[PDB]
Symmetry: D2
Subunit: 502 residues, 4 copies
């Protein structure tokens, strides 16, 4: 009943550790016990094992490398089929399997779980119509609304190219010269930048999406996932201490929660707005640096999910999980958010580099809907039979069905094109008085409704910018003072204690 | 009933061919029917299909790239358990599933099946004790007995580095300076170099292996797979005409034979010799350029196999098939043939590069025996679950079994070592009088027993070496004359007609 | 002095072929000359050499795998700065270094040069504004005008998924159900499908491009490279016979021409038309299955190029060469031809798969213009220094320049957009009377201007389609009848000779 | 003049952040400034940039992933040509460029530089006879003397397969069941396990090597690199506190020292013994868990080196640095140390996976000696010319030189072989009285020459093993008691304070 140890080709071994050698004769030695001589090329059992060891590592995710995952279940609790025709949403009580990967953004594989960063909150829905990936963050906004900036931004959040050190000069240099970032910089430097538990943070679509009901009518949609335990944060000092005591604290917190039977859960809501309402708003629905104010666009519950099952093997199920915003179902479509648009290409592109072209044959990534793609064949590590003899083009010798086209309803026309295609840069140095700082001003007031939050924000910025040199510091005070002047000045005063000038 | 056409994530499509575009207004045009404008990045269906198309190709085999394959069944017909304790051999009537790949050596993926070359004949036995790969050729000898020469030799059989053309001058320059090659050269240029059908040629281990019985006694073994249809060949002109009319002839011949129920079959024999017999022979059992004479080491039948099932998908089952001499079972071990010894390393090495580290999880390569390698984990495209939570070392928390070592019997000791390790080159320029030219002379005598074979052999060499320059041609005549001077002169005469001088 | 033979780390070897072994004692053997025993893992020279050998192969191009190349020189011979501000065109007599690769389409790397196929004619211009790639074929049209059809089409031109054989049934099944293919199909089965020499064929942009002058005015453009030796073709039987005798005929022809100094050269022309002209045509300038009639849009010479330098290493310069339509200069832009659009993505995508992310650091692919991409860093096999310590974002610490944007002149506006984005399928079954069959009828009349070309065309089709089943054959006869009924009947008659019915 | 920002193909860009879109008409909106619509596939500048970003990451090293490096200079100070004929040692004052990489072992990228671990101390010497890699550690011993154990051991030093957390249970389960490990375990849990600075640690060959002089006489060698600043360590609490404050401390420490001209240096010594002396010792020179006592084998100085130049780009020079013990020069050979032997295969094996087959063409890895390997050609990312048209085998048409064989002097013959090859396991449960515990007892006494070192050792273990379960704890106490019982008692006392029992 105990399994036989083997080689990769399945032949039983007789000793796990012994290896083959042309023994030297040492019988006359003071210590003749060893049997030692040059190793032999024919020791398959050894070379098999060393060559596999030598290839264990695959490239880490270019961002969001450090992660933790679980499986679970999503359940419809309200009817929203007036908004969305999705089959997994079409019945109250209908359940769907999910897999979630939580992550930080900037850190590599050995980095701390408690670092200041946005958190990835990425969920795969295994539906009867295909795998739906909701690739969300723990924040409803982001630093950019121009997709060309992401390599620049991410570089400045990581390490200097000569030293391999983190560098506050470049970190802040990028942000003060691309000032659309300020809304998410404030959220990042609140205490939500250091959640106390992955079970105690929210997820947000961030982007606007477009959902279609069975009549072909579409609305714009924001999605909100709210922890049933609420948002609970560490502060800057707690998080930094924990980084040196348990860099894997959140991984274990989630795992142990699930082993105990204390399954974390989330409630799911949408905001919706019509094209006619969008035209009336002071912000674009395509602007990822904006939220939709709750008073004008209230949240509407539609479901809940629970993570109740730890992975059996982390590398196979978590490290190898692939999520893409372009993995959708017919009723849920991307908006023209420039950042989302670029994400549609970027995830599959990176997946093919990191995992291989057939990465969706890896079990965690397999759809449960039947996949039928006759024209997509071969590629490295084809393990699913490659559709056998099925013709590999749209053929007369093989029948198939297509769906009927979701025809857009005249009641809700698609957006009308302007007269030409153009290039556009939606960013840079912005005016203090424009609506681009009004949401950051609103975030400051939201801080002020909870005692301690404004002071923590200013302290969290100061300990970080104190490391940058004095000229960058000054640009940073101006930058926050474009929100409210008192913010930049409270930060300047604390930075001057930490970083003296004389 | 017909399957729905989908994308890679399982989402049904509505149109197989339509693609998204920012349409230009052409309503006032002379022909206003087209709807054309710049393509949109958000067309996942399209980009999904093209990105997969762009990665269809995996690297081809460095040698033996062009092949054909079939599944079948091997059956024990005689008891040789006195020679070999293998479980798949341990009962007359016992059947084992097999997979065979046939191939040429030098040619690439679109080369002619009917070209002059050795033919590969590699079979995977899916046994209870693991996958046994018998990686054989259609010749019992080979060009080399020094492993370092294989890159040298193979390069001269392929293309000039500057022109990408075949080059008679390097082809023959290699051979006349490494004269251990002549035995296999004569076989190559006999009509067996152009088999009429893969169902009508033999397979041979070529190397000596060492097989062990339940008592731990071992003997040297040569293996012979003889077609139940006999050896049937094309002549040089048939084979060359076919290169242009049907370069896939053998591939279709095998496939059609199986489709119509004419299942090809082979009978399996061994030759055996003890260490005491080996010590008396004029040749080394470790010399791949040597056969064992039949009158002295007669063939002993043990089984048969039949290829009776075509692949469903050529790429997934044939192009991804991986074979290695070092994939064996405990009762069958390699001898110290230096060429075989380096093949133990080179095939798994090249497999990892061509297919990926986990290529034994591709279905055709999967063992049917239970595989248990707790210390070999992760790597690209882990699709078998990666052993779940099983500890990844030899641990107390997880019990396992090993086999008992096959203790070598004092009645057949292992070979005794000399005093020191050393470096050795077993080739180069050789003496006409030595035993290294004796088995070539015997092959000449064997040609002579069938009318036309001696004539054809000289013709087959002549047409090839006439493309070399005159100084090389001279060395070639001189090389064949080390066998019998009649041979070199007979070839010189015909080469002079084809390649006039002065 | 002659160089020292080394290992890969530069250590001089003492013997090229000797290898290290734990020698067996065979002093008492009849033949004791061998020094043979198991090979040692510590033989770096052996293993280093075999491990490299094991990794020689990279994936072949998914199409156009079989190819031949040469470096040369483009020279401006007429001033066209009224049409195009490209710097490499800005002076009569300006010389630019080029690299050209020719190829077939469906054949793999070992396949026949003389096969019936379109030929690729791809040229890289190393200009002071960047590397411009003109990725052209030897035909001015192509089988598709929907980018999604390419994988389907190419698959049908290649091998059956189960048998790995070419398959006339799928070949013609695709063509007869996607009837826009017929113009290029007729070009293919003319004798231009079997050129006698890469030196004796033309190149064509095929797609419409859009070229801009210093004022921002733009015109649609078609480029023609006409061989100074004119177009010379084999007939079907010569090509088939040469497939068997010299599958590398074209490669040797090109190489030997340059070796002996008979440098091939082409003369370069453009056709041009304005947006206003385009609106009057019965064809779209975005339709790759269409040409521009010569008497309406006459050729205008602008230069010439000569191929005068053979590669020194085929693998390093030809096999690793990478071309993309999206590698362009600022004054030359793509049109909304839907096929050309998808090619902008597909080629850099497949390059990263086939060659690695940093394939443009491979010497043949390097630009001679200074590259400065601070935000594009790292990746496998960074060999160019990786910009040293240069910041990896757009920074205040590193000064840089950007050119000015070519502002589109109000004289020649960009194309106006329609109201909405949409999905379009530009093909399928077409009406015989429509203009989609008019340019095919004209090609027939061009064939008629030369005795035998019409009958040769029908013969070339018949011998190919005779292999397909009788239901496919029937569809093919109607297909060609849609051009003119006499064509379908001529082909039916000969196929009946070859493929009897009764 | 400042450089022009370009695309990868060298075309200058006009704007660094603007991207193309099919703009939606929002002229009527409350805020009509945005120009936003779906992104275009033809935006090469964007897709080029994103596709490169998507591929920045290569696999991290399977071990020693976290690292820091610098260039420098080695200088001969004393003559040892009586021991070694290396050309780089043959003259007093001779200088050789070096590159050094330091690293931890277990930690991934992003982990703490201050972690308890061995330190990699790895150095590449660019000699005129080839690149010599001295792949050393900061300890003269290691955990194993059986190569098959390295994957087991490393796995237990890293993360649990299910949770992805470090696991003290598997960490100690491996060590107490393979008790040859204890010598290095004591060194690891001394304060040398947490150096204060990479500049303040020693390096050691660990393995015995064999060095040959010009007469062919060889001795066994051990190499010692002693920091000119001495060995300076943190205590456990300092190490841990620093992990949270500055996980990149050692990296910055080395960089800034060099930046400010405080170049670290090391003095280089050897121990040597003849085969005659080795046969008298209580330990095998092939045993990596042993040192040579200084009193019997005193250090002999021969040179020094200084790190005086920081890398310009960390990824290109440090991350892509590749070292291997089998990169050597003819006068420096490996011993039959079983661990060392397996390292000769394993490092190039992983290099080809991690960096590609042609990784020695990456600048930091290039030899400065002329490399000439005609039989090693092609492969992915061939960037050095591939030897042009040089023949790719040992050819009559290319002259070359080989060096003379260093023929072993009969005054120092090679080791004599026993009768047979065999398999062997040199570890497991060991007897307390055997010599395998003598050097650990001696290390205990070394600790006791300095106040508090014995107590710090026990504390450093106890805080680690306190996290294991009580049965594993009990086994750790017995394990250390096999050295001296007082050691286990002390550890048990402190563990009980941290891990109380009922
Ligand atoms: Cl406050
Ligand atoms: Cl590899
Ligand atoms: Cl004859
Ligand atoms: Cl890729
Ligand atoms: Cl004590
Ligand atoms: K948002
Ligand atoms: K495809
Ligand atoms: K043989
Ligand atoms: K497609
Ligand atoms: K055209
Ligand atoms: K040692
Ligand atoms: K090689
Ligand atoms: Na011994
Ligand atoms: Na239209
Ligand atoms: Na001998
Ligand atoms: Na606008």
């Amino acid at each position: 009943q105990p399994p036989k140890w083997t080689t990769s080709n399945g032949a039983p071994v007789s000793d796990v550790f012994a290896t083959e050698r042309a023994t030297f004769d040492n019988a006359n030695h003071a210590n003749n016990a060893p049997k030692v001589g040059p190793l032999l090329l024919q020791d398959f059992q050894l070379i098999d094992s060393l060559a596999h060891f030598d290839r264990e590592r695959i490239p880490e995710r270019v961002v969001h490398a450090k992660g933790a995952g679980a499986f679970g279940e999503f359940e419809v609790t309200d009817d929203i089929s007036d908004v969305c025709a999705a089959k997994f949403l079409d019945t109250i009580g209908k359940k769907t399997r999910i897999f979630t990967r939580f992550s930080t953004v900037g850190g590599e594989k050995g980095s701390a779980d408690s670092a200041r960063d946005p958190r990835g909150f990425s969920t795969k829905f295994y539906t009867e119509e295909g795998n739906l990936d909701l690739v969300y963050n723990n924040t409803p906004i982001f630093f950019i609304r121009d997709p060309s900036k992401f390599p620049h931004f991410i570089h400045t959040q990581k390490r200097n190219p000569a030293t391999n050190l983190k560098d506050a000069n470049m970190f802040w240099d990028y942000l003060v010269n691309n000032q659309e970032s300020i809304h998410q910089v404030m959220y990042l430097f609140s205490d939500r930048g250091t959640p106390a538990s992955l079970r105690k943070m929210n997820g947000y679509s961030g982007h606007t999406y477009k959902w279609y009901n069975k009549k072909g009518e579409w609305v714009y949609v924001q999605v909100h996932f709210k922890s049933d335990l609420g948002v609970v944060n560490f502060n800057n000092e707690e998080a930094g201490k924990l980084a040196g005591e348990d860099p894997d604290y959140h991984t274990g917190d989630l795992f142990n929660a699930i082993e105990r039977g204390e399954y974390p859960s989330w409630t799911c809501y949408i905001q919706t707005m019509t094209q006619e309402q969008a035209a009336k708003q002071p912000f674009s629905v395509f602007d990822l640096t904006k939220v939709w104010p709750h008073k004008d666009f209230p949240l509407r519950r539609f479901g809940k999910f629970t993570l109740n099952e730890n992975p059996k093997n982390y590398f196979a199920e978590v490290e190898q999980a692939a999520f893409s915003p372009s993995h959708t179902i017919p009723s849920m479509q991307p908006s023209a958010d420039p950042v989302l648009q670029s994400r549609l290409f970027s995830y599959p592109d990176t997946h093919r580099h990191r995992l291989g072209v057939n990465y969706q044959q890896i079990p965690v990534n397999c759809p449960v809907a039947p996949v039928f793609t006759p024209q997509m064949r071969d590629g490295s590590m084809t393990v699913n039979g490659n559709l056998g003899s099925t013709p590999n083009y749209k053929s007369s010798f093989c029948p198939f069905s297509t769906e009927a086209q979701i025809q857009t309803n005249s009641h809700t026309p698609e957006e009308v094109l302007a007269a030409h295609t153009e290039k556009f840069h939606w960013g840079g140095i912005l005016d203090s008085k424009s609506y681009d700082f009004e949401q950051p001003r609103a975030l400051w007031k939201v801080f002020g409704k909870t005692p301690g939050q404004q002071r923590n924000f200013c302290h969290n910025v100061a300990v970080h910018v104190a490391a940058a040199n004095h000229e960058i510091q000054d640009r940073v005070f101006e930058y926050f003072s474009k929100v409210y002047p008192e913010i930049g000045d409270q930060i300047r005063k604390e930075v001057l204690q930490l970083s003296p000038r004389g």
